[PDB]
RNA sequence: CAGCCUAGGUAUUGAUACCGAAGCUGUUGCCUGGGAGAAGUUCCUGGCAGCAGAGGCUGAAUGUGCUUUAACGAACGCUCG
C-alpha cells in the first residue's frame, strides 16, 4: 500500500508536468523538504522534476 | 550548465592514451553535472561529476566537488557482457571562503595540477609508498 | 466553357463505366467551376473542379487546375452515416505563356491524355509502379 | 513499368501528330524517371517526367507525379542559339491512400483522360475560357 | 533477371495453394526489384524483394538478397478496413566471392532449396521445434 | 526434429547431384544443430546449421536460423592437402510472433522453397543479373 | 538505346577477333548500363559500361562516360582457376553544353574513332611511344 | 609515334566530311603532342593532344591520355572576328600495366573504336540516349 | 550575418495550414546490438554524428565587438542631361 501511495504522488507529479505549471508542480516537492523552501530563480518542468 | 566535450589527453603512465567525454545531463538539486566515454557499457564508460555549491545555510563556504570513475573494463567473462571488477574511485573536494579570490582558486587549481603532473604524487598513487 | 452535364464514356480498367457530371456552378471568391455526379449522398459524390486564373501582374503566368476527387465510404456496423473512410485526389495544373498559342496548349493536353492512357503512366499509377 | 520508347499518336487539334518520347533513366538521387523526345538540341526537346513516391510516415500517402514539359525557342537575328523562350508545363499529381485499390485508381485515370478530352477543358485551356 | 509474373504453385502445408506475384519498380534508392500479389490491396500487402549487390570496398563478395513479406490482417466485427494483426518475414542471403563459380552458386541455390523442403526444417519451421 | 543423415537428392545446375550431410550434434552453448558431409578433412566439407531462437524478453519473436557453407578444394597438384581458395555462404531467418501460425509459417517457407526454383532468382544467384 | 547483345567485328592487331558482349542490366544507383563478355566467373570477363548523366543544376553540361576493362587470365597449370592478374582500363568521357548539337555529337565521335584508327594512336599504345 | 599530316576522313553524322590535322610543338612542361586543324584560324580552334605518361611512383601503370576540342563559334550579325558560343570535348585514358603487352593493348584500343562504331554508343551519344 | 521568397517538402474532406532544412542519395568516422558459420573470417541485422548532391532575391563587414558611431540645411567633388 505504501509503494501505491508512491506511484499515486509521482503520478500526481507527472500530471502537473504534463498539464504544465512550474510553482503548482511543487506540490509534492514540498512533501519532503519538510521546509517551507523558497524560490531563486525561474525553473524549468523538466528540471523540477528529473532529480527535485 | 555543463554541456562541453572535453577531449582529454596523455592518459597512463606512457602517456599515450586519449579520452573523450561527453555530457550526459546535469542534475537539477545540487548544480551538479555529468560527462561520459562514448560507449554503451557501464564499465567501459567513464565518469565524471562535477558539482559547484553556492552558500545558503548549514555552511558559509563554497564547495567544488568532482567525482570520477573509471571501472576496470574485462573482456573476457563468461560471454559478450564486459563486466567491472575494479572500481576506480576518485573523490575531490574544494572549500573556498565567500571572500576568496578568482586569483586565489586559480593558485590552488594550479597546484594541484602541477604536484599531479609531477613525479611527487605519482609515486604515492601508483606504486604506494610512504614519505621516507 | 459554358457549364454543362458532362458524360465521360469508356472509362475504368475495362473501358465500360460512365459518368454524368453535373455543373455546381461557379465559386464566385476563387473564381472556379465544380461539377459533381448525381447521386443520394452529396458527401459520396465524385466532384471535379476547374479554375482558369487571368495573368496576373507583371509575371502573367497563365495557370490553369483541375482537381478530381472521388471517395468511398463503408458504413460501420451501428452507424447511421456512411462515413467517408477512403478519398482519391488527382490535381492537374497548366502553365502558359503570355504568347503560348492554342497551338501548343492543345498539343500539351492530346500529350498529356495520350500519355494518361500509355501503358507506362498505366502500370505506373493502376499498380504503383515505379517506372524504371 | 519498364521504360521503353512511348509512341503517342492521334494529338494536336486534329489529331494527326505524334511523339516519340525515349528513355531518358531514372535519378538516383528523387528517383524519377524521364522520357525525351528526340531531336538535334537536347535544350529543344518535349521531356515528360514520372514519379511515384513510396509511404510515408503514420499517414503514408501515396503520391504519384507527371511533369510535362514543352519548350520552344525562337532564334533571335544575329545570335546563333535557339534560345528556348517559350515553356509549356503540365504538373499532374495523384494522391492515394495505401487503402486504395486499382480499381477506383484506373478509375481516377481513366476519368482524367475522358475530362482531359471532354468539351469541357477543350474550351477551358485551348481557348483560356474559364467554365461558368 | 528479368521482372515479370511469377505464379508459384504448390505452396503451403500440403501444397495445394498458389501465389502470383506481378512486378514492381526497381527501387532507384537502392536498386532492388519487387514483387507483389496479383492484387488489389494485396498488393501493398505481400512483398517480395530481391537485390544484387555488386563487389565493393564494404562488398568484396558480391552479396544477393532476398527478403519475403506477409502481413496478416484482420477486420474487427465492425471496422471496415483491414488492420494487419500480424507479419510473417523471412531473409534470405548468398555472398559470392569474386572468383566464385556459376555451378556452385546454383549448387547453394539447389541444397538451400532441397533443405528447406527437408522434414528436418519444416519440422523446427512449421512447428517452431528445435532441433533434439 | 531430431537430427539424422540428411539426403538432399538433385540439386545443382542440371540437377543431378546428391549431397549426404551426416549427424554431427548440437552445439548447446548456443543451441545449434550442425550436419555435415562425409569426409575426414574439416576444413573441406560442406556444412549446414539450424537454430531455433525462442522469443526472448528483449525479443519477443521466434526465431529460425539457418546456414549453409560450401569451400572450394583448388587442389594443389602436390606440395599437401588442398587449400581453402572460396567460400559460398547461404544465410536464411524466419521471424514470428507468439500468436504465428503453423499455416503462414508452412506458407512462407514454401514460398521460399518455390522463389528460390523460379527462374528470377535462377539468373539473380546465377548470373549475378541484378533484377531488371 | 535498348539494351542489346553487342556483336563487335574485326579487332585486335591484326584486326580478326571479334567480341560478344550480352546485356546484363543497368545499375540504378548511378544509372550505369552494363555489358560483359559471356563466362562463368566474374572475375574473368571482359566488359563495358555506359552512363548518360543529364544537365545537373550543379554542373549544367551532358556528359557520356564509357569505361572498359579487360582482365588477364593468366591460368595456372592446376591447383585452382585463373587468377586476375593484369587489368586494362579505357575510359572515354563526353561532354557536350544543353545547346549542343547531334551533328556536332556525331562529328567528336567519329572523330575519336578514326583517330584511334590513325597510325599516330596506333603507336602511341600498342607501342607506348611518346608522341614525337 | 611520329608527328605528321593526319587525314582523318569519312566523320559525323553521315560519315562524309574529311579532317586534316597537321602538328603542333609538344609541350615540354608536360610532354604532350598536339595536333590542329589544318588552318587558318581554326589551327588555334581545334586541337587533337596526345600524351604518354610513364612509370613513376605514382604511374606504373603507364597512361595514355588523348584529349579533344572542338570549338564551335559565330559571327554576331554586325561583328567581325567569331566568338566561340559552344566547346564540345572528349577525353580518352588508357591505364596500361608494365608487364601490358601490346597485343592486349591493341585489342583494347580496337575494342574501343568499334564500341565507338556500334549503335548503342551512336545513339548514346549522338542523341544522349541512356541504354534502357 | 540578417532578412525575403520559392521551385520543393509537407499535410490536408477539396479549400486551406507549417517549413525552406525539407527529402532522399551516397560517403567519413563513432558504431553497438541482436544471431552465428566457426572464423587463420564470412554471413544475417542495427543506430549516432559529420561531409558532398534545392534554389535564388535584398541589405551589413571589409581584421573583430559595441555603448556618445546621430539629425538638420549649404558648399565641394561627382553622375546626368
Same mark, same amino acid.
Given at each position: ?46 528540471? #523540477?522534476?528529473?532529480?527535485? | 550548465?555543463?554541456? #562541453?566535450? %572535453? ?18 545531463? %546535469? ?13 554503451? %557499457?557501464?564499465?567501459? #564508460? ?52 565567500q571572500?576568496?579570490?578568482?586569483? #586565489? ?14 613525479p ?5 598513487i ?7
Amino acid at each position: 500500500k505504501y509503494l501505491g501511495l508512491l506511484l499515486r504522488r509521482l503520478r500526481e507529479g507527472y500530471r502537473a508536468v504534463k498539464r504544465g505549471d512550474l510553482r503548482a508542480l511543487r506540490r509534492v516537492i514540498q512533501s519532503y523538504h519538510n521546509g517551507k523552501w523558497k524560490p531563486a530563480t525561474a525553473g524549468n518542468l523538466w528540471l #523540477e522534476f528529473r532529480y527535485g | 550548465a555543463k554541456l #562541453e566535450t %572535453v577531449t582529454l589527453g596523455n592518459i597512463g603512465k606512457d602517456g599515450k592514451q586519449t579520452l573523450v567525454l561527453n555530457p550526459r545531463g %546535469v542534475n537539477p538539486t545540487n548544480g551538479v553535472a555529468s560527462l561520459s566515454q562514448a560507449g554503451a %557499457v557501464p564499465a567501459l #564508460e567513464k565518469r565524471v561529476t562535477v558539482s559547484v555549491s553556492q552558500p545558503s545555510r548549514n555552511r558559509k563556504n563554497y564547495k567544488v566537488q568532482v567525482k570520477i570513475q573509471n571501472p576496470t573494463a574485462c573482456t573476457a567473462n563468461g560471454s559478450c557482457d564486459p563486466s567491472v571488477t575494479r572500481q576506480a574511485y576518485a573523490d575531490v573536494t574544494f572549500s573556498f571562503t565567500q571572500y576568496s579570490t578568482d586569483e #586565489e582558486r586559480a593558485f590552488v587549481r594550479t597546484e594541484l595540477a602541477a604536484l599531479l603532473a609531477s613525479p611527487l604524487l605519482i609515486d604515492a598513487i601508483d606504486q604506494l609508498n610512504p614519505a621516507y
